[PDB]
Short mmCIF file of C-alpha atoms and ligand atoms in Angstrom, two decimals:
data_model
loop_
_atom_site.label_atom_id
_atom_site.label_comp_id
_atom_site.label_asym_id
_atom_site.label_seq_id
_atom_site.Cartn_x
_atom_site.Cartn_y
_atom_site.Cartn_z
CA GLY A 22 0.00 0.00 0.00
CA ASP A 23 2.63 2.47 1.25
CA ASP A 24 4.85 -0.20 -0.51
CA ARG A 25 2.80 -0.02 -3.79
CA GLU A 26 3.22 3.79 -3.82
CA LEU A 27 6.98 3.44 -3.05
CA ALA A 28 7.42 1.02 -5.99
CA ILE A 29 5.59 3.31 -8.46
CA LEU A 30 7.72 6.29 -7.22
CA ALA A 31 10.97 4.27 -7.49
CA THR A 32 10.06 3.10 -11.01
CA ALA A 33 9.27 6.69 -12.13
CA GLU A 34 12.57 8.10 -10.66
CA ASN A 35 14.46 5.28 -12.45
CA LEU A 36 12.76 5.82 -15.88
CA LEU A 37 13.16 9.65 -15.64
CA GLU A 38 16.98 9.05 -15.65
CA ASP A 39 16.63 7.74 -19.28
CA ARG A 40 13.75 9.81 -20.79
CA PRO A 41 11.28 12.62 -20.09
CA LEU A 42 7.87 12.11 -18.44
CA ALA A 43 6.23 12.53 -21.94
CA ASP A 44 8.00 9.27 -23.11
CA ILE A 45 7.05 7.29 -19.95
CA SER A 46 3.66 5.53 -20.11
CA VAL A 47 1.43 4.45 -17.19
CA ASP A 48 2.00 0.89 -18.56
CA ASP A 49 5.78 1.49 -17.97
CA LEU A 50 5.18 2.66 -14.36
CA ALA A 51 2.67 -0.16 -13.62
CA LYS A 52 5.04 -2.77 -15.17
CA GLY A 53 8.02 -1.45 -13.12
CA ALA A 54 5.97 -1.56 -9.90
CA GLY A 55 4.66 -5.10 -10.69
CA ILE A 56 0.99 -3.95 -10.87
CA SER A 57 -1.65 -3.53 -13.56
CA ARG A 58 -2.67 -0.20 -15.16
CA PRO A 59 -6.00 -0.05 -13.25
CA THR A 60 -4.19 -0.76 -9.96
CA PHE A 61 -1.82 2.13 -10.80
CA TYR A 62 -4.86 4.43 -11.06
CA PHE A 63 -5.91 3.42 -7.52
CA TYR A 64 -2.63 4.95 -6.17
CA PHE A 65 -2.20 7.93 -8.57
CA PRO A 66 -4.47 9.69 -11.13
CA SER A 67 -1.73 10.34 -13.72
CA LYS A 68 2.01 10.10 -14.31
CA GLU A 69 2.06 13.92 -13.64
CA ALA A 70 0.81 13.24 -10.07
CA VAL A 71 3.64 10.71 -9.59
CA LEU A 72 6.22 13.41 -10.56
CA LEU A 73 4.53 15.87 -8.16
CA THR A 74 4.95 13.39 -5.30
CA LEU A 75 8.61 12.68 -6.26
CA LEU A 76 9.44 16.37 -6.36
CA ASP A 77 7.54 16.92 -3.08
CA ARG A 78 9.75 14.22 -1.46
CA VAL A 79 13.03 15.80 -2.74
CA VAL A 80 11.98 19.33 -1.77
CA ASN A 81 11.01 18.21 1.74
CA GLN A 82 14.29 16.23 2.03
CA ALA A 83 16.20 19.52 1.36
CA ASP A 84 13.94 21.48 3.70
CA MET A 85 14.33 18.97 6.56
CA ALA A 86 18.12 18.94 6.09
CA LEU A 87 18.16 22.76 6.28
CA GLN A 88 15.98 22.57 9.45
CA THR A 89 18.49 20.12 11.03
CA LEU A 90 21.32 22.55 10.24
CA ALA A 91 19.25 25.52 11.63
CA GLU A 92 18.54 23.59 14.91
CA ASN A 93 22.31 23.29 15.67
CA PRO A 94 24.43 26.19 17.02
CA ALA A 95 25.69 28.44 14.15
CA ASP A 96 29.13 27.70 12.64
CA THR A 97 31.41 30.49 14.04
CA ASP A 98 33.13 30.67 10.56
CA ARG A 99 30.77 32.81 8.39
CA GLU A 100 31.95 31.40 5.06
CA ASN A 101 31.64 27.77 6.24
CA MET A 102 28.21 28.54 7.76
CA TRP A 103 26.83 29.56 4.33
CA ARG A 104 28.76 26.80 2.45
CA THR A 105 27.20 24.06 4.59
CA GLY A 106 23.76 25.48 3.96
CA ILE A 107 24.18 25.89 0.17
CA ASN A 108 25.59 22.34 0.16
CA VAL A 109 22.26 20.98 1.44
CA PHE A 110 20.70 22.11 -1.86
CA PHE A 111 23.71 21.12 -4.02
CA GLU A 112 23.72 17.58 -2.58
CA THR A 113 19.99 17.01 -2.22
CA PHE A 114 18.96 18.16 -5.74
CA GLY A 115 22.27 16.92 -7.24
CA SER A 116 21.61 13.44 -5.82
CA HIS A 117 18.17 13.40 -7.58
CA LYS A 118 19.02 14.92 -11.00
CA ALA A 119 16.25 13.00 -12.88
CA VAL A 120 13.56 14.40 -10.50
CA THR A 121 15.25 17.84 -10.49
CA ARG A 122 15.22 18.00 -14.35
CA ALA A 123 11.62 16.68 -14.66
CA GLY A 124 10.40 18.90 -11.83
CA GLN A 125 11.99 22.03 -13.37
CA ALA A 126 10.31 21.24 -16.73
CA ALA A 127 6.95 20.68 -14.96
CA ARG A 128 6.94 24.19 -13.32
CA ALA A 129 5.87 25.42 -16.82
CA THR A 130 2.92 23.00 -17.31
CA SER A 131 1.72 22.17 -13.72
CA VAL A 132 0.13 24.75 -11.33
CA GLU A 133 0.73 22.28 -8.46
CA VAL A 134 4.45 21.92 -9.24
CA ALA A 135 4.84 25.72 -9.65
CA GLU A 136 3.05 26.40 -6.34
CA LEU A 137 5.11 23.72 -4.49
CA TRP A 138 8.36 25.28 -5.76
CA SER A 139 7.13 28.84 -4.97
CA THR A 140 6.07 27.87 -1.45
CA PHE A 141 9.48 26.36 -0.55
CA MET A 142 11.46 29.14 -2.25
CA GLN A 143 9.55 31.67 -0.09
CA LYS A 144 10.42 29.62 3.01
CA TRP A 145 14.09 29.40 2.04
CA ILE A 146 14.29 33.12 1.20
CA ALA A 147 12.63 33.98 4.52
CA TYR A 148 15.13 31.81 6.38
CA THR A 149 18.06 33.37 4.41
CA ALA A 150 16.79 36.87 5.26
CA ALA A 151 16.46 35.98 8.96
CA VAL A 152 20.06 34.76 9.07
CA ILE A 153 21.35 37.91 7.29
CA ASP A 154 19.26 39.98 9.83
CA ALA A 155 20.86 38.07 12.76
CA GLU A 156 24.36 38.69 11.25
CA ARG A 157 23.58 42.44 10.98
CA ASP A 158 22.16 42.52 14.55
CA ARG A 159 25.43 40.90 15.92
CA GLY A 160 27.51 43.49 13.94
CA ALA A 161 28.98 40.75 11.67
CA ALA A 162 27.30 42.01 8.41
CA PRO A 163 26.81 45.64 7.24
CA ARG A 164 23.35 47.15 6.77
CA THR A 165 23.37 47.43 2.96
CA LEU A 166 20.43 46.15 0.83
CA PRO A 167 17.08 45.20 2.34
CA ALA A 168 17.85 41.68 3.62
CA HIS A 169 14.73 40.06 2.04
CA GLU A 170 15.54 41.53 -1.43
CA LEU A 171 19.20 40.40 -1.22
CA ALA A 172 17.99 36.96 -0.03
CA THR A 173 15.59 36.72 -2.95
CA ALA A 174 18.22 37.43 -5.61
CA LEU A 175 20.75 35.04 -4.01
CA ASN A 176 18.16 32.21 -3.80
CA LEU A 177 17.10 32.81 -7.43
CA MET A 178 20.73 32.78 -8.50
CA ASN A 179 21.11 29.37 -6.80
CA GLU A 180 17.90 28.02 -8.34
CA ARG A 181 19.04 28.87 -11.87
CA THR A 182 22.77 28.23 -11.47
CA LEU A 183 22.57 24.87 -9.63
CA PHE A 184 20.04 23.68 -12.22
CA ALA A 185 22.17 24.74 -15.19
CA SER A 186 25.16 22.89 -13.61
CA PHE A 187 23.17 19.68 -12.90
CA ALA A 188 21.65 19.63 -16.43
CA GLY A 189 25.03 20.35 -18.14
CA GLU A 190 23.48 23.41 -19.90
CA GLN A 191 25.55 25.74 -22.08
CA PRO A 192 26.16 28.12 -20.38
CA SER A 193 26.77 26.65 -16.93
CA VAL A 194 29.33 26.60 -14.13
CA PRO A 195 30.95 23.14 -14.06
CA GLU A 196 29.30 21.03 -11.35
CA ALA A 197 32.66 20.66 -9.60
CA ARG A 198 32.98 24.47 -9.38
CA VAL A 199 29.40 25.59 -8.66
CA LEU A 200 29.49 25.34 -4.85
CA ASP A 201 32.62 27.51 -4.52
CA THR A 202 31.19 29.95 -7.11
CA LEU A 203 27.91 30.43 -5.24
CA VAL A 204 29.54 30.59 -1.76
CA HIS A 205 31.87 33.39 -2.96
CA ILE A 206 28.96 35.46 -4.31
CA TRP A 207 26.85 34.89 -1.15
CA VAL A 208 29.64 35.78 1.27
CA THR A 209 30.92 38.83 -0.59
CA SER A 210 27.40 40.19 -1.09
CA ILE A 211 26.24 39.54 2.51
CA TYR A 212 29.42 40.81 4.22
CA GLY A 213 30.75 43.39 1.75
CA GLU A 214 30.30 47.12 1.29
CA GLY B 22 7.22 43.25 -47.85
CA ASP B 23 9.62 44.37 -45.10
CA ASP B 24 6.39 46.31 -44.14
CA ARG B 25 4.21 43.12 -44.22
CA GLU B 26 6.70 41.38 -41.89
CA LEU B 27 6.79 44.47 -39.59
CA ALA B 28 2.96 44.49 -39.35
CA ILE B 29 2.77 40.76 -38.48
CA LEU B 30 5.54 41.27 -35.83
CA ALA B 31 3.78 44.35 -34.37
CA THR B 32 0.45 42.49 -34.23
CA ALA B 33 2.06 39.49 -32.46
CA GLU B 34 3.88 41.72 -29.86
CA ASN B 35 0.54 43.51 -29.21
CA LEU B 36 -1.54 40.28 -28.79
CA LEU B 37 1.16 38.66 -26.56
CA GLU B 38 0.51 41.52 -24.04
CA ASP B 39 -3.03 40.05 -23.50
CA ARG B 40 -2.59 36.25 -23.93
CA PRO B 41 -0.04 33.49 -24.56
CA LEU B 42 1.07 32.36 -28.04
CA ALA B 43 -1.15 29.20 -27.61
CA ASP B 44 -4.30 31.47 -27.54
CA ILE B 45 -3.20 33.55 -30.59
CA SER B 46 -4.28 32.14 -33.97
CA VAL B 47 -2.68 32.76 -37.40
CA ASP B 48 -6.11 34.28 -38.30
CA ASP B 49 -5.51 36.80 -35.41
CA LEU B 50 -2.02 37.70 -36.72
CA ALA B 51 -3.18 37.90 -40.37
CA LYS B 52 -6.23 40.03 -39.36
CA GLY B 53 -4.02 42.40 -37.29
CA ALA B 54 -1.56 42.80 -40.19
CA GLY B 55 -4.42 43.37 -42.71
CA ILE B 56 -3.56 40.23 -44.76
CA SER B 57 -5.10 36.82 -45.40
CA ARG B 58 -4.00 33.55 -43.73
CA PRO B 59 -2.26 32.26 -46.91
CA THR B 60 -0.41 35.58 -47.30
CA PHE B 61 0.74 35.20 -43.65
CA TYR B 62 2.27 31.82 -44.59
CA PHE B 63 4.30 33.53 -47.35
CA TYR B 64 6.11 35.63 -44.66
CA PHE B 65 6.28 33.08 -41.77
CA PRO B 66 5.70 29.29 -41.48
CA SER B 67 4.02 29.40 -38.04
CA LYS B 68 3.19 31.71 -35.15
CA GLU B 69 6.22 30.08 -33.36
CA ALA B 70 8.50 31.50 -36.12
CA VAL B 71 6.99 34.97 -35.54
CA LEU B 72 7.90 34.75 -31.80
CA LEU B 73 11.44 33.61 -32.74
CA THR B 74 11.88 36.71 -34.91
CA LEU B 75 10.45 39.01 -32.17
CA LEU B 76 12.78 37.56 -29.56
CA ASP B 77 15.70 37.75 -32.02
CA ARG B 78 14.97 41.50 -32.48
CA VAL B 79 14.85 42.17 -28.68
CA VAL B 80 18.00 40.13 -27.98
CA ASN B 81 19.92 41.94 -30.74
CA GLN B 82 18.60 45.31 -29.47
CA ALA B 83 20.17 44.50 -26.03
CA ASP B 84 23.36 43.21 -27.63
CA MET B 85 23.79 46.30 -29.84
CA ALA B 86 23.17 48.59 -26.85
CA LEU B 87 25.86 46.72 -24.87
CA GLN B 88 28.22 47.04 -27.89
CA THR B 89 27.61 50.84 -27.96
CA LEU B 90 28.45 51.03 -24.26
CA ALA B 91 31.61 48.83 -24.79
CA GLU B 92 32.80 51.10 -27.68
CA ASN B 93 32.92 54.17 -25.35
CA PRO B 94 35.71 54.78 -22.79
CA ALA B 95 35.00 52.91 -19.48
CA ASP B 96 33.16 54.79 -16.71
CA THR B 97 35.90 55.59 -14.11
CA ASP B 98 33.33 54.80 -11.31
CA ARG B 99 33.29 50.95 -11.04
CA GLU B 100 29.81 50.71 -9.55
CA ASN B 101 28.28 53.04 -12.19
CA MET B 102 30.15 51.16 -14.95
CA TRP B 103 28.37 47.89 -14.03
CA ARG B 104 25.01 49.62 -13.29
CA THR B 105 24.88 51.16 -16.77
CA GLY B 106 25.58 47.79 -18.32
CA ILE B 107 23.01 45.85 -16.24
CA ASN B 108 20.54 48.64 -17.07
CA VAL B 109 20.81 47.81 -20.78
CA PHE B 110 19.20 44.43 -20.00
CA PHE B 111 16.75 45.82 -17.40
CA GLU B 112 15.46 48.45 -19.86
CA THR B 113 15.59 46.45 -23.08
CA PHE B 114 13.81 43.30 -21.80
CA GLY B 115 11.65 45.36 -19.37
CA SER B 116 10.43 47.50 -22.30
CA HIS B 117 9.32 44.30 -24.15
CA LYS B 118 7.74 42.25 -21.32
CA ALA B 119 5.25 40.42 -23.62
CA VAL B 120 8.12 39.16 -25.86
CA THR B 121 10.31 38.48 -22.78
CA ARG B 122 7.55 36.33 -21.14
CA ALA B 123 6.68 34.46 -24.38
CA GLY B 124 10.34 33.98 -25.27
CA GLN B 125 11.18 32.58 -21.80
CA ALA B 126 8.26 30.09 -22.09
CA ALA B 127 9.42 29.09 -25.61
CA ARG B 128 12.98 28.11 -24.44
CA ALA B 129 11.27 24.90 -23.14
CA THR B 130 9.48 23.94 -26.42
CA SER B 131 11.68 25.49 -29.22
CA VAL B 132 15.27 24.34 -30.01
CA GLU B 133 15.73 27.55 -32.04
CA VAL B 134 14.66 29.81 -29.15
CA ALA B 135 16.86 27.85 -26.68
CA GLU B 136 19.90 28.05 -29.01
CA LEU B 137 19.35 31.82 -29.65
CA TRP B 138 19.23 32.49 -25.89
CA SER B 139 22.26 30.22 -25.25
CA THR B 140 24.31 31.89 -27.98
CA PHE B 141 23.75 35.42 -26.62
CA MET B 142 24.21 34.39 -22.98
CA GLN B 143 27.62 32.92 -23.95
CA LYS B 144 28.50 36.22 -25.66
CA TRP B 145 27.39 38.26 -22.65
CA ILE B 146 29.23 36.00 -20.18
CA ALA B 147 32.38 36.21 -22.32
CA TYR B 148 32.16 40.00 -22.37
CA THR B 149 31.54 40.09 -18.56
CA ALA B 150 34.59 37.85 -18.00
CA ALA B 151 36.77 40.05 -20.23
CA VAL B 152 35.80 43.15 -18.25
CA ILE B 153 36.49 41.42 -14.89
CA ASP B 154 39.89 40.28 -16.38
CA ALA B 155 40.70 43.90 -17.41
CA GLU B 156 39.75 45.11 -13.86
CA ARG B 157 42.10 42.48 -12.35
CA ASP B 158 44.90 43.38 -14.81
CA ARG B 159 44.62 47.13 -13.81
CA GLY B 160 44.75 46.11 -10.08
CA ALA B 161 41.13 47.33 -9.51
CA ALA B 162 39.67 43.82 -8.76
CA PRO B 163 41.24 40.96 -6.72
CA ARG B 164 42.13 37.62 -8.30
CA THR B 165 39.48 35.47 -6.57
CA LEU B 166 37.24 33.05 -8.56
CA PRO B 167 37.95 32.12 -12.18
CA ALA B 168 36.50 35.16 -14.00
CA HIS B 169 34.45 33.09 -16.52
CA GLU B 170 32.80 31.03 -13.73
CA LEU B 171 31.97 34.16 -11.69
CA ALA B 172 30.64 35.80 -14.89
CA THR B 173 28.47 32.78 -15.61
CA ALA B 174 26.80 32.75 -12.19
CA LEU B 175 26.22 36.54 -12.24
CA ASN B 176 24.67 36.41 -15.74
CA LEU B 177 22.43 33.47 -14.73
CA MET B 178 21.38 35.34 -11.61
CA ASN B 179 20.35 38.28 -13.83
CA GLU B 180 18.51 36.03 -16.29
CA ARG B 181 16.38 34.48 -13.56
CA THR B 182 16.01 37.51 -11.29
CA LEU B 183 15.15 40.11 -13.97
CA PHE B 184 12.60 37.68 -15.42
CA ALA B 185 10.96 36.97 -12.06
CA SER B 186 10.71 40.77 -11.46
CA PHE B 187 9.23 41.51 -14.93
CA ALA B 188 6.67 38.65 -14.64
CA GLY B 189 5.66 39.62 -11.06
CA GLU B 190 6.49 36.06 -9.86
CA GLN B 191 6.29 35.06 -6.20
CA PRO B 192 9.09 35.11 -5.18
CA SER B 193 10.64 38.12 -6.92
CA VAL B 194 12.51 41.33 -6.19
CA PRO B 195 10.16 44.26 -6.84
CA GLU B 196 10.87 45.70 -10.30
CA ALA B 197 11.71 49.07 -8.72
CA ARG B 198 14.39 47.39 -6.54
CA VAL B 199 15.91 44.80 -8.91
CA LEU B 200 18.57 47.02 -10.53
CA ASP B 201 20.05 48.13 -7.20
CA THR B 202 19.84 44.52 -5.90
CA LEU B 203 21.77 43.07 -8.85
CA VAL B 204 24.35 45.92 -8.98
CA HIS B 205 25.17 45.36 -5.27
CA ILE B 206 25.74 41.63 -5.79
CA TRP B 207 27.85 42.19 -8.95
CA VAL B 208 30.06 44.87 -7.40
CA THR B 209 30.62 43.13 -4.07
CA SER B 210 31.38 39.80 -5.76
CA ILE B 211 33.70 41.28 -8.44
CA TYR B 212 35.61 43.64 -6.11
CA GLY B 213 35.41 41.86 -2.74
CA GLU B 214 37.58 39.36 -0.91
C1 UBQ C 1 12.38 21.82 -9.36
C2 UBQ C 1 13.43 22.89 -9.60
C3 UBQ C 1 14.89 22.48 -9.70
C4 UBQ C 1 16.02 23.45 -9.27
C5 UBQ C 1 16.37 22.87 -7.89
C6 UBQ C 1 17.61 23.19 -7.30
C7 UBQ C 1 17.63 24.63 -6.83
C8 UBQ C 1 17.70 24.80 -5.36
C9 UBQ C 1 17.66 26.21 -4.93
C10 UBQ C 1 17.80 26.49 -3.47
C11 UBQ C 1 17.72 27.95 -3.15
N1 UBQ C 1 18.18 28.18 -1.78
C12 UBQ C 1 19.42 28.00 -1.39
O1 UBQ C 1 20.31 27.54 -2.26
N2 UBQ C 1 19.78 28.27 -0.10
C13 UBQ C 1 18.84 28.95 0.81
C14 UBQ C 1 19.02 28.72 2.28
C15 UBQ C 1 20.40 28.38 2.77
C16 UBQ C 1 20.82 29.06 4.07
C17 UBQ C 1 21.51 28.35 1.74
C18 UBQ C 1 21.17 28.17 0.29
C1 UBQ C 2 13.99 35.07 -23.27
C2 UBQ C 2 14.45 35.08 -21.82
C3 UBQ C 2 14.01 36.22 -20.91
C4 UBQ C 2 14.90 36.69 -19.73
C5 UBQ C 2 15.51 37.96 -20.35
C6 UBQ C 2 16.09 38.93 -19.49
C7 UBQ C 2 17.39 38.43 -18.91
C8 UBQ C 2 18.59 39.17 -19.37
C9 UBQ C 2 19.85 38.64 -18.83
C10 UBQ C 2 21.12 39.35 -19.18
C11 UBQ C 2 22.33 38.69 -18.59
N1 UBQ C 2 23.48 39.61 -18.68
C12 UBQ C 2 23.57 40.74 -18.02
O1 UBQ C 2 22.56 41.11 -17.25
N2 UBQ C 2 24.68 41.52 -18.14
C13 UBQ C 2 25.87 41.02 -18.85
C14 UBQ C 2 26.80 42.04 -19.44
C15 UBQ C 2 26.85 43.39 -18.79
C16 UBQ C 2 28.23 44.00 -18.66
C17 UBQ C 2 25.99 43.60 -17.57
C18 UBQ C 2 24.82 42.71 -17.32
#
């Protein structure tokens, strides 16, 4: 039951490594999960709903990892503090590139995917802004741009730049350089005048 | 002839203000240009080809403006130098929001739109990197990240952030704040250690 759903989700994540959702049939998902087509429809209404659930799992995996980091005392080294946090996103989305690629594409065609992504980006921006505000309050960061506006641009940079790196787009930062690239821009923009 | 093509392009840019390309018919474009459907097909093969030409015009308008700025002596004020350049993109794409929105959407579905955008982003990144290299050579900027990698991330930030602002996405930087936001991040990341 839970196990049926897990098998459909695992099959979909596997097939998305090889081809887009458009070239994956319900027969393919049902076959991979060892069930019939009609039994598939008991668990999910469409292959698009399967992708929504996969992306929801990956997004909440990143969010929960960030929460675990937030619960711990702050790294006393400002650059390392931000690197560890950006690395949650680098590793979580980078470890699920098939879902990341299919989920990005689906933001265009699916209101539910677009709203899921928007909701979590707002959460992540709000958290970023609250950390920059704490750094300013402690006298560690200068009072330059409105923190929420700076947070927004930095989060959008990461959204576009990490994706271009994962997907091997031209142009892109090489995957093996993207974390250092983003950390530099975050730290100089948060701490600089 | 040239004038036929201009009227079809003007009609398409006007209708894209109100609805997406999917809800614009060839009859709509032909009607707006004062021609028949078959006469439309003499000038363009599809409504998608019309959008390609519109986006090509806007992209080359931005590129030519950047070239005009590049031809002049450099602004001696580093922050203003980068602000004027980012403003070319802010004003050119911001003055054509209907084409910008339709062109962004088309990167997903059109190889020709995706390649056009990729080509000009590579050009703009290469130019950015060459300016950062000149600033380092003159001793005005520190030798931190590889210039081309830093340029790539900053250009991708602008691509995503300017678009989110123009489209009124949630999240986004308000349009009236986006130029200052991006200039701050560029200048601190290019000149900071
Ligand atoms: C579906 C779609 C695909 C795409 C995906 C990937 C992207 C991701 C992004 C993220 C942002 N954010 C960040 O990055 N951060 C914040 C907080 C912290 C503190 C750090 C960082
Ligand atoms: C179709 C799609 C839509 C989207 C559009 C808009 C975006 C734009 C972007 C640009 C990048 N770049 C920049 O920004 N820059 C460089 C150089 C100079 C020097 C500055 C700046």
